Design an enzyme around this catalytic site. Structure first.
Site, PDB file in Angstrom:
ATOM      1  CG  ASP A 139      -2.189   0.934   0.981  1.00 22.00           C
ATOM      2  OD1 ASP A 139      -2.296   1.559  -0.093  1.00 22.00           O
ATOM      3  OD2 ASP A 139      -2.984   1.074   1.931  1.00 22.00           O
ATOM      4  NE  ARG A 143      -3.775   5.550   1.232  1.00 20.95           N
ATOM      5  CZ  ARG A 143      -3.788   5.262  -0.068  1.00 20.95           C
ATOM      6  NH1 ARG A 143      -3.913   6.234  -0.972  1.00 20.95           N
ATOM      7  NH2 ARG A 143      -3.671   4.006  -0.476  1.00 20.95           N
ATOM      8  CG  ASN A 144      -0.155   4.525   3.646  1.00 22.20           C
ATOM      9  OD1 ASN A 144      -0.744   4.963   4.642  1.00 22.20           O
ATOM     10  ND2 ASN A 144      -0.658   3.571   2.902  1.00 22.20           N
ATOM     11  CG  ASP A 157      -0.652   3.230   7.410  1.00 21.08           C
ATOM     12  OD1 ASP A 157      -0.715   3.103   8.645  1.00 21.08           O
ATOM     13  OD2 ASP A 157      -1.129   4.210   6.795  1.00 21.08           O
TER      14      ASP A 157
END
Ligand SMILES: *CCC(=O)N1Cc2nc(-c3cc(-c4cccc5ocnc45)c(F)cc3F)n(-c3ccncn3)c2C1
Length: 300
Positions: A139, A143-144, A157
């Site tokens: 992922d 945003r991560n 994450d």
């Protein structure tokens, strides 16, 4: 698996005090840890996973949390603690600056080429570390990626997809749920595109169901106005159908590090001369205050 790398936390040792943001897997909170037999309030970051968990999954959840707690790299957030009750609570160091996605949005057309290329190097360094440990992120996205300081970013994450981001996923992952180091390279390509466009949503307006057909046709994310054809070419090599033709993370570290030595040659930014090269004075302040950990020198 080193059990000493993961601290099992009880609900009485910590308290959530403010919602920082929400996502598809959970909600991020600013928390406070009150250690056993002490009076101090230590700020922590807690993420609560919103699926109804049971104590049967506990052994498996804990086995995953031990792996997330083992990752030791300047460019990867390692899991520090966990609390398993009816919900899953993941505890790590609080990073005030938030994610790199929101950072490039809030600093739209105000980031120098030197930062963008160095972030590309740092993200590739952390991903290369995960690849060396034989771990797939599954992922990777802006945003991560979290901002420790404007000069130091860390991928977050890792592991919680295992325990969907269609527009960041490689074609083989959409079609066959196959996740490898090479499908992480594809997401790295999209993550780079998110930075170069200052947080633009990839394939805006396009329904997630149509993405695989668009990819089969050869359609890819558009060249950001600030990238030269060489930066765009590296991104396009990340989105090739044949996974083995995509660049390796070790090759991406070298390429963006070469680019970081001549920042103006690879990115075209208006007012790039004015965009503050981190002065020794500011770097020392940032480092002594909130970044005492070891980290590879930033490419100047
Ligand atoms: C743009 C979105 C945004 O601002 N943020 C997303 C986000 N998540 C977290 C975060 C992540 C984790 C976590 C989860 C899995 C593995 C891992 O290894 C260490 N930490 C990991 C948390 F446990 C808590 C958590 F809040 N943050 C965040 C914000 C501030 N400080 C730290 N993390 C953000 C920001």
């Amino acid at each position: 698996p080193n059990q000493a790398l993961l601290r099992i936390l009880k609900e009485t040792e910590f308290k959530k005090i403010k919602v920082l943001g929400s996502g598809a897997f959970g909600t991020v909170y600013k928390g406070l840890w009150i250690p056993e037999g002490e009076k101090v309030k230590i700020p922590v970051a807690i993420k609560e996973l919103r699926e109804a968990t049971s104590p049967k999954a506990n052994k498996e959840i804990l086995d995953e949390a031990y792996v997330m707690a083992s990752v030791d790299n300047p460019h990867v957030c390692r899991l520090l603690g966990i609390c398993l009750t009816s919900t899953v609570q993941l505890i790590t160091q609080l990073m005030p600056f938030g994610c790199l996605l929101d950072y490039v949005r809030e600093h739209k057309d105000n980031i120098g080429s030197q930062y963008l290329l160095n972030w590309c190097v740092q993200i590739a360094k952390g991903m290369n570390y995960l690849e060396d440990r034989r771990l797939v992120h599954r992922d990777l996205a802006a945003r991560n990626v979290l901002v420790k300081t404007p000069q130091h970013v860390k991928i977050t994450d890792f592991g919680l997809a295992k325990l969907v981001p269609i527009k960041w996923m490689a074609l083989e992952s959409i079609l066959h749920r196959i996740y490898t180091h090479q499908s992480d390279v594809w997401s790295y390509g999209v993550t780079v595109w998110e930075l170069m466009t200052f947080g633009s949503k990839p394939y805006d307006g396009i329904p997630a169901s149509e993405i695989s057909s668009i990819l089969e046709k050869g359609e890819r994310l558009p060249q950001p106005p600030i990238c030269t054809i060489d930066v765009y070419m590296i991104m396009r090599k990340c989105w090739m159908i044949d996974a083995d033709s995509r660049p390796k993370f070790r090759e991406l570290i070298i390429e963006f590090s070469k680019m970081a030595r001549d920042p103006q040659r690879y990115l075209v930014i208006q007012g790039d001369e004015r965009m503050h090269l981190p002065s020794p004075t500011d770097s020392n302040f940032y480092r002594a205050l909130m970044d005492e950990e070891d980290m590879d020198d930033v490419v100047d």
